[PDB]
Ligand binder design. Sequence first.
Ligand SMILES: CCCCCCCCCCCCCCCCCC(=O)OC[C@H](COP(=O)(O)OCCN)OC(=O)CCCCCCCCCCCCCCCCC
Ligand SMILES: NC(=O)C1=CN([C@@H]2O[C@H](COP(=O)(O)OP(=O)(O)OC[C@H]3O[C@@H](n4cnc5c(N)ncnc54)[C@H](OP(=O)(O)O)[C@@H]3O)[C@@H](O)[C@H]2O)C=CC1
Ligand code: SF4
Ligand code: SF4
Ligand code: SF4
Ligand code: SF4
Ligand SMILES: [K+]
Ligand SMILES: [Zn+2]
Lengths: 94, 176, 341, 207, 95, 44, 114, 103, 112, 205, 145, 125
Amino acid sequence: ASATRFIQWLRNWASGRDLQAKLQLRYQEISKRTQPPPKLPVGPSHKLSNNYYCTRDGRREAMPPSIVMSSQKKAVSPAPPIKRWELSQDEPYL
Amino acid sequence: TYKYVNLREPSMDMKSVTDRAAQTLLWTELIRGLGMTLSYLFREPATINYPFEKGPLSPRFRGEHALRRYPSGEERCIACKLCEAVCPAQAITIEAEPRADGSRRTTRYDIDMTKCIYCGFCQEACPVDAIVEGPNFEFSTETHEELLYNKEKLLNNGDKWEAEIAANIQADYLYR
Amino acid sequence: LHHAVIPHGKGGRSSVSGIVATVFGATGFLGRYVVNHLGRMGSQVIVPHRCEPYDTMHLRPMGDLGQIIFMDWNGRDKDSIRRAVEHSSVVINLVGREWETQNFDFEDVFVKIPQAIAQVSKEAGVEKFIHISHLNADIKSSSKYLRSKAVGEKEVRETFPEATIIKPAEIFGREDRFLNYFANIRWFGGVPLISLGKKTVKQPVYIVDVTKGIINAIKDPDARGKTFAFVGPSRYLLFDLVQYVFAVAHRPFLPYPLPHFAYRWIGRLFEISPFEPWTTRDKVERIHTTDKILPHLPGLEDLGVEATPLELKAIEVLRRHRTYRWLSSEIEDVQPAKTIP
Amino acid sequence: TRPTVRPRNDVAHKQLSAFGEYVAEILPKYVQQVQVSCFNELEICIHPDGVIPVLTFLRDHSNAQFKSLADLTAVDIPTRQNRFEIVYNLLSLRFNSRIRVKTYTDELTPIESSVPVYKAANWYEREIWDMFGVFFANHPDLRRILTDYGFEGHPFRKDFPLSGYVELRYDDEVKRVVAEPVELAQEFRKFDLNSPWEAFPAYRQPP
Amino acid sequence: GVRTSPTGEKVTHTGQVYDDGDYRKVRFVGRQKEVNENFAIDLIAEQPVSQVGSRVISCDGGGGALGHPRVYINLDKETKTGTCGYCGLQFRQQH
Amino acid sequence: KVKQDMPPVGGYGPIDYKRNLPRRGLSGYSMFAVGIGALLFGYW
Amino acid sequence: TSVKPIFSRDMNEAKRRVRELYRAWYREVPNTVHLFQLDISVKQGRDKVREMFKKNAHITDPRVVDLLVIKGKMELEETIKVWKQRTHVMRFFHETEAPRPKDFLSKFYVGHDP
Amino acid sequence: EMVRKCDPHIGLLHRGTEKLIEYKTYLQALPYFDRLDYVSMMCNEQAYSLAVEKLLNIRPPPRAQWIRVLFGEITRLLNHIMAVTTHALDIGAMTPFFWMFEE
Amino acid sequence: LKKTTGLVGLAVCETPHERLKILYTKILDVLGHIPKNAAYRKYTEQITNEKLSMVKAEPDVKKLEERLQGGQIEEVILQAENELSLARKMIQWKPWEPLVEEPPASQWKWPI
Amino acid sequence: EEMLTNNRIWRNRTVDIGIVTAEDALNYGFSGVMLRGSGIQWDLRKTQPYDVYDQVEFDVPIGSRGDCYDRYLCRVEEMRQSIRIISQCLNKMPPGEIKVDDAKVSPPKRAEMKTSMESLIHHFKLYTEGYQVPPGATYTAIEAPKGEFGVYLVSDGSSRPYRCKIKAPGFAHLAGLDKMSKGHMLADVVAIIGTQDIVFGEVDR
Amino acid sequence: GSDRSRFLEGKRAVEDKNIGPLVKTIMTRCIQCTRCIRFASEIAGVDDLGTTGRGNDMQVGTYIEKMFMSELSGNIIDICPVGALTSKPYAFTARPWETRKTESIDVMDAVGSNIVVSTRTGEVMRILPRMHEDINEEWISDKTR
Amino acid sequence: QLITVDEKLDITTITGVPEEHIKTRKARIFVPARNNMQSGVNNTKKWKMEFDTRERWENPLMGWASTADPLSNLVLTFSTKEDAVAFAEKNGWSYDVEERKVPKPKSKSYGANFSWNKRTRVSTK
Ligand SMILES: CCCCCCCCCCCCCCCCCC(=O)OC[C@H](COP(=O)(O)OCCN)OC(=O)CCCCCCCCCCCCCCCCC
Ligand SMILES: NC(=O)C1=CN([C@@H]2O[C@H](COP(=O)(O)OP(=O)(O)OC[C@H]3O[C@@H](n4cnc5c(N)ncnc54)[C@H](OP(=O)(O)O)[C@@H]3O)[C@@H](O)[C@H]2O)C=CC1
Ligand code: SF4
Ligand code: SF4
Ligand code: SF4
Ligand code: SF4
Ligand SMILES: [K+]
Ligand SMILES: [Zn+2]
């Protein structure tokens, strides 16, 4: 930020860019190092009623694997064939 | 969506061909690269003047450990051993007994700072804010034995650093 | 035994051997092996040092955490001696120098200093005391080094009657000034030997044998008050030994006889060096002193150490003295020197 | 859609089940069990003799096309007479699907090297040999890969101790690094953590 | 407080001190024994007993959620004071 | 009320990411012409 | 009792693999001592090789013998290609380890280990 | 200088991470994943977290999922700067390393 | 005609329709030696005939690629070559045969 | 890019160096840029998305020559796409809690831990025993910066994993170094090591 | 149980009671299960423990000041499900997860009670009973304990 | 093709264990007794194998518990006694097996608390 005008011009010309608009050294646009305290929200299970744990218990819904075949009609694939990707409309070629 | 990084066909009009001949013979794209390093020569360097200047840190920084007290001066640690149980490195060793006044207090509280991974789990686990990682990171030593902290060292750290530690906890305890 | 010195563990790095040893002269050739062997088994070692702390760094890996403790000391200051010994159970004295300096002469290092360590150790209640003398120590010796070894040996026994005194021959090993000394002569062309080395007989002893003998003396209750002579298993003529040295190193050997008076003049020349003299008159004398035969003293066999033949270990010392052409020659490529029967 | 519970994808469970019995129908000589977990992962448990036929079929068959071997590992279960379970995790880019193939072996029984099917399997099998001691037959170059030269034992076995049997230090007398029996200044502290109360009734084993 | 043994070695708040003839005190020679001088057992005793008007009082150590878990202390015995098991503050019920 | 780190009401301003290597320099003809011009002056 | 073999179908076939490995180790010792510049003699190196083969003389399972030979070949390959360093070669000689006497009394004096 | 064969010998940084994890709780094992690809720390944490969340049959809240993607892509920037600049440094171009390591 | 398939090492095929017809017809011939009731034969004939139908009835490469859903037509040719290689290998393995051996009692029980 | 991308010296060191074909890359177990540099259209963030990757827009860079230069271009463009994703994450960041509101898995807030009996119990148990995980095994992978990073995680129902195999993308990549270096000089092997983007913390574990 | 609390009131607090030097009582932790009362009456044959008051103020104890010094008294530490009754000698010295359990035999008498010796870092920390139906069931004597 | 091997399984030479920790060790095969402090029985389901306890000593520096026993923390879990015994035999460990102790079935009767003429009448509830 403290460079003289001629030096700013010289390095702007050498790099071909306007380097003063996006300096890599941080000045005063960064946040203050002291902030007001937060007040964080609570989660969906913070309730006084209609909140029995047995209705929101993910672990107790896990089940042992389904046995499809054990040693005790059209062909299928594991899933449908993957759809072909489309070219980017933002910038297809770099 | 995808894009091609390198799938382009150079044009073959005489101007473009000569433009490339000048590039090959006059080194124009190599000269261009010299321009970039020249611009950096005249940019102010990013170097800070350590130890007179310090890199920025935040209240959450995990540094040297310390055992804390209540405002009365009593130790916060009540030898629950939660920090010892959670320590991923098994860096904490604790023994405890009833104090002469009956209090539940430690007789051993060691942290092997060469085992510790400075993960902060111990201070998350502590129910009374007894064990913390303070903001000090400048405590390298000349011997290995100097990094095997016992309770006296850790309490001295707390007394040494409590002014900063309390302010750091004040800034961040509402995110915890 | 105080409960802190009861042995525990299986004799490894993290064990407790129960030995608390103060080793004076631990920063030298013999000390590095003694400190290594103590630290191997989990002993507490106090290393009082006069030198720059940089020159004690090789000792640091030798013990588990907290098992090597370094202290500053001065051979003239008796307080500095007291602080380094008053917690120890054994004191080992390896202080010595092969040349005199402006500040310390043979009397200082082989009489005054060893006597002070023994006196302070006795006053401090130290139980065991091991003192290294020399096989060829003799009051009637042309070598002032050996004359002082005789005086100090008598003083230690009188000050600390229960001391174990060890009298080794010349000791050979990687960092010795024996095999390395002869091998380094090559830099002057031929090898000058008084009377062509035919009138001297040496019985050199391996460094690890001396170290194991020192360690077994600490643990042996019978070693208290005794005097041992640590000698190698074979005697050689000096000429044969030096010829063997040059054969192992594959260096050209040109021995020529030099009279005693001419060698002394050469010795005085090298003494002018203000650093570590390459040789001295006294060094020339000791190298040409025949190694005494002392059948009445106990030896390495009496401490459970089987002496290592020089033939099995010379290459370990002398390989670095060869040129590239001969670096890889094996141990069996050189025939042993004639051993006196 | 309870916010804290992982949602169920029933379409995938149906699709993977259908393909599960599709593989069982085609390779009955080797397939012993097929299962799909509650998070939609299909596992094929086969006799070890079928490692090459099953993996070749999954790679090459036009309705499978599992061209990438994502991972090949082993698990040690000492209570089984065949203590080592060998696990192949495969990926199909054509069908955007994954499949796990599992077989078994013991300390003295070789498994066929699957390098001819997946060149990726070369180093994975060296790791399994190194860490578990499972020998792979016809491996182009089977040797330790992770452990130290001359290391004795197979550390990832459940009965190999955590800190091993030997440790290293530099010894000044022999002027080299030496190996000696392991002694720890502080023994690792074994914690007994399991609660004595059952957690998941759905997985209770019959008495 | 911090006492010294007859050898001069400070006694810690845990009562530790090497006895004479313990070689391990050599580790302090030329250096020092780190001892914290603020004994918590002495500091807490200095706090005054708090008089309250109820049979049960709660303690969280002070500072809200920066103290310890909130506990309730019964003050029915007049033969002694209620003590917080976390921080050691004492309470008494007045008349 | 709830206070936590959030974006500003309207969002953040646009952020460049696409490659930008500006086009600079004279054409091949002009550059060669200057080179030959210097050479001819040197020879003369 | 019907199991898949590793290499050898029986102990007679296995013992042939052992002998070939012993020859390979026996021939290599002079090279190992020279290349690694060891301070042991070829006799010591070959005695050690014999000691390592002797400790497994009681095996009667062809699969176990086959695995011992496979590891022996791997160990030999590490040595011949100087993947091993001098420290690895010398680990067979346990030079820095002090003798642990095997008599009852000697163990009794030093600790509780049987 | 023609390369006739490459034989990468690894294990010089093998630290038995996978055996050590068997002695840890799921929380205690999490920091081991920071130290695997120690340039992509938070991406490694995420992979382990997704695996445990899958076996647990629980779902992380939407804000955490957005923070994870945000810091996953910041981590991807960290990795690619290291990947490209050290790659260029090995090939002899030392200056991009310094410009980009300030970022 | 395509200039490139986009996948490194996959050359563009000049005559993909005829090449596909050769390969699928070869695949069907090899399946003839597999037992009729083997599931590998029944399934592979079914899906192989579907692809052969689509190649015959669609002359445009791009429109054919869309129907096949196998990526580039060169990718589809490679898959046909892979399937043909598998069919030959299946003849020696004979995986349609009954299970060679049951596992021990609790080989697949988890948790132990 | 001004320093490298069109620099002829850079191109000479990277163009047509370490060419790997799309077929070999798949069979050798490659992933990430090591696949896309050779034209394979694959990215787990697109095909098997996790977290909220299905809600952000970005492009996957694809190579054409399968050499070091194309893999360098892919990584540079991937950085630009990362910035593009970061922009959306900043704008679309929602409010709410940041760990699952289920105190048998995620520890309670410290203020709850110090007031509520249930929260103190769960905090105590989570930091000592830890949460139990229902028995099972999963292979889970993400599009890590170096490629596909996965864990094969085996639970036995207790609070400690029974087995944890880590799948490091660099493990398979480094195993292909000998294949990729064929016909190249020593200084090309230096380039090829860098193009694989290897970190031995993950290769060795 | 559930994973959170909706109790927004103040808690009950109960005074502690001395019942000897072996069992420490922190009775605010008592959950009024009456296991101790039943054990004292039925196993130890001692009718000193009981409940006083009623409702939420019901208190387990001896009403008067009395020590529960039976040769089997220490067993109420085991059967108390909470930390209301704990061992005074063991107080604060260890946590359960860190102890190693050695299954052994008591030698304080000739009954041969089966015990578990809890140790930590090379030190014996406490003695617990070990179920043997044909010997000590799940009890030990105070001398054993 | 399968071969016939009729010997007992003994992998002691290929497991890499030092000799002192095969022949000098004593494995204990048992079902852990219930922790008497708790009523839950879920830690009494499986069989365990543990080894004899060896010396621990105080570290001179810190007072920590040092050991030279590499098997000090090694614990193996088995579904049945037979599985544990087979594992011990093939590894060459001498072992002691202890029978699983199952709680005896009991006759519980709430009504006995109020017996007309028996001693089971309780004096308090
Ligand atoms: C009147 C009739 C007149 C007749 C006479 C007319 C003569 C003039 C017209 C002839 C053409 C003039 C230009 C000749 C200069 C030499 C050009 C040259 O050799 O460049 C080619 C060389 C190879 O480039 P490359 O693309 O890799 O390969 C080509 C395809 N095989 O490219 C390179 O050399 C690359 C070099 C890489 C290393 C560069 C590192 C330094 C770069 C910065 C230096 C800047 C130059 C400063 C010079 C200072 C002079 C004191
Ligand atoms: N061939 C041999 O080596 C034989 C040796 N001995 C005796 O063994 C003992 C040690 O042998 P070696 O170790 O080879 O001798 P070194 O010279 O190799 O080591 C001598 C030690 O004494 C210390 N020392 C010397 N002078 C002084 C002094 N003035 N004040 C304080 N410390 C001093 C040195 O410390 P610094 O490093 O600080 O100088 C060094 O640690 C000596 O007594 C020697 O005479 C006996 C028979 C043969
Ligand atoms: S920071 Fe982590 S490793 Fe260090 S003591 Fe605390 S819990 Fe243990
Ligand atoms: S968690 Fe806190 S109170 Fe508990 S032992 Fe550790 S430091 Fe002390
Ligand atoms: S056993 Fe414990 S919880 Fe139950 S009534 Fe007695 S003191 Fe209260
Ligand atoms: S450990 Fe159990 S008895 Fe003690 S306070 Fe916690 S819940 Fe209550
Ligand atoms: K209790
Ligand atoms: Zn309080």
